[PDB]
């Protein structure tokens, strides 16, 4: 849906136009705009509190933002940990079919997710990181073959949307490639961790469509 504004909010926002307050609009409003379409109550309550606080103490949002940016290395550490954990297969992906072809697919999916989760600990040595990138390539390569080997040969259930998750996996796989290239110019490693964690999620979605 869409956030609603009270009269008191309307008044406050109109009285809050000095330059120190622009980060409310330039950074927080786009956030509230995205939040709106998945979590309406949070978006509205958070905007409400931000607007009142900003109006009564202009500069507050800028202060909060700068302090969040200051704590960047907490977030890098946190994102590293998310990635490391992402490989911990819940055993709800493990294919219930005893066939060697579905056993082959599980192992190659565990393989790829395993290497990707170790990125935080290889990235600081260019030699080891280059190897890791090579291992990722072989893992992706070997998984796509097993998908294709099981695709035409076996299943073809009620869902042929298994085709789309391969198209998605590839799209996300190509995107991770771009992020690596961007990192080797930026040094901003957080983009790589975020990107590796998405590819893991996509690998899981392939494994989910075979069950449900």
């Amino acid at each position: 849906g869409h956030m609603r504004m009270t009269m008191e909010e309307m008044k406050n926002e109109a009285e809050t136009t000095s330059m120190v307050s622009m980060p409310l609009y330039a950074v927080m409003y786009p956030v509230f705009n995205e939040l709106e379409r998945v979590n309406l109550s949070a978006a509205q309550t958070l905007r409400a509190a931000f607007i009142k606080a900003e109006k009564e103490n202009p500069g507050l949002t800028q202060d909060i933002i700068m302090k969040i940016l200051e704590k960047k290395s907490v977030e890098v550490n946190f994102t590293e940990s998310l990635l490391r954990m992402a490989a911990d297969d819940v055993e709800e992906y493990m294919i219930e079919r005893p066939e060697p072809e579905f056993q082959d697919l599980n192992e190659k999916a565990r393989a790829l997710k395993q290497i990707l989760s170790k990125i935080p600990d290889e990235i600081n040595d260019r030699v080891r990181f280059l190897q890791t990138i090579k291992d990722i390539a072989s893992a992706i390569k070997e998984l796509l073959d097993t998908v294709n080997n099981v695709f035409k040969k076996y299943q073809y259930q009620n869902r042929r949307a298994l085709e789309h998750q391969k198209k998605e996996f590839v799209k996300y796989s190509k995107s991770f490639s771009d992020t690596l290239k961007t990192y080797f110019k930026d040094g901003k490693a957080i983009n790589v961790f975020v990107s590796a964690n998405r590819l893991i999620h996509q690998t899981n979605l392939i494994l989910q469509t075979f069950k449900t």
């Binding site: 280059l130 990138i133 090579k134 990722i136 390539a137 796509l144 796989s173 190509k174 490639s177 690596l180």
Partner: peptide, 12 residues
Amino acid sequence: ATRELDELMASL
């Protein structure tokens, strides 16, 4: 090392 990753995405 970077080559084979670029060679894979080229096939796709």
